[PDB]
Point group: C3
Chain length 164, copies 3
């Protein structure tokens, strides 16, 4: 929908602005602004999850991956803010978002690969790469969640290789 594509573009801008605003707040020792920026990233991740959920349910796999790319970017910014704050609760929140994204991206990737949409499955696998980067930043000692991305990536890329 034209309304949801516009909303996702604005959500991405809020994520970019939150990243720079957190850098300034960290330099100033403004922990209150750091908490407001963190809540901004959480709010964007919540809305992006909404859109990806409705899009995947209504069959729009392309809109779902656009919303998931923003969800992952918001979780990455939230993990950065958690590092700036030295706050493990914010780090746990970003890790939960990365898990939610990995499960949805995996489902969309299998759906696109089953239907033979190679480009859509490639875009999904690209987001799962960015998800693994967030997992490394948040909880790198949870080898189960990281191996799950590596297995789902390895099992699918070999299938896509056969169809080319």
């Amino acid at each position: 929908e034209g309304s949801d594509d516009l909303l996702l573009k604005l959500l991405e801008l809020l994520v970019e602005q939150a990243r720079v605003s957190a850098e300034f707040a960290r330099r100033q020792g403004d922990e209150k602004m750091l908490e407001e920026v963190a809540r901004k990233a959480e709010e964007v991740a919540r809305k992006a999850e909404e859109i990806a959920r409705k899009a995947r349910k209504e069959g729009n796999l392309e809109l779902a991956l656009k919303a998931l790319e923003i969800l992952v970017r918001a979780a990455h910014v939230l993990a950065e803010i958690a590092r700036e704050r030295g706050n493990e609760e914010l780090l746990k929140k970003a890790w939960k978002l990365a898990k939610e994204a990995l499960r949805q991206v995996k489902e969309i990737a299998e759906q696109a690969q089953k239907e033979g949409n190679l480009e859509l499955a490639i875009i999904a696998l690209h987001i799962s790469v960015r998800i693994a980067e967030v997992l490394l930043e948040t909880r790198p000692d949870d080898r189960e969640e990281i191996r799950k991305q590596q297995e789902e990536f390895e099992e699918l890329i070999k299938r896509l290789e056969k169809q080319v």
Copy 2:
């Protein structure tokens, strides 16, 4: 204008090459190359600024935003060169370029939504976030200029949210 579009692509290449050339010049202790790269980045910023003004005059807002993106990238490269060589005056010139780009981006961003062109208003806000990053690298203690960018960002994006 296809000619001005290709010209900006060439200016984009000169900025990217200036960035890497500055890294080598710093490694070899070649202050002669470090000075040549710095003014090369300055000449690109002025040329991108000229194209931006002419594009804005002709009513081509998309071309003006492409030129300003080059101007900001040139200012960032200048800031990286300056903070490397420890030159406060080169940092000041890069700050000045960022402040001028911010003023032009804010004008285009309102003119874009005044014509109902939400996509160009979104691109302008993208550039303003890149400008805020340059302000962080040049004068982080100029709290008024960054607060000015955040207020303009919030005011405009809230207007665009009302169109979803």
Copy 3:
């Protein structure tokens, strides 16, 4: 087609960089060796596609494959420089050297023929190669000089042709 295969090789390059970070975190030197070999394999397949695409005169496709060859060499250099592995840092330098020779040739051909868009893409890859040369052989003043003369001489020609 070669377009879809290149998109797959690029995905393998992205996963290799993240898999190498986890391998270093876990201290698995055997996994680091496997990731480096997969990056080396992607670089070789990209060079194959570049040579084929150039033989048919499909310069657009050749530059897409050379872009991936440079990204593969860039990932290799990061693994080598992080581990301090001088051996892998030399193999990445050889891939960058090979890419710059092919990129410069396509950049000259495109500029002579007037394909301004393809010449710009080639010059963009040349900048990415100079970055890899910084990571692998920073003290080699000559290769970077030649990259800089080739770059500025080709830019000047394109400014006139635009």
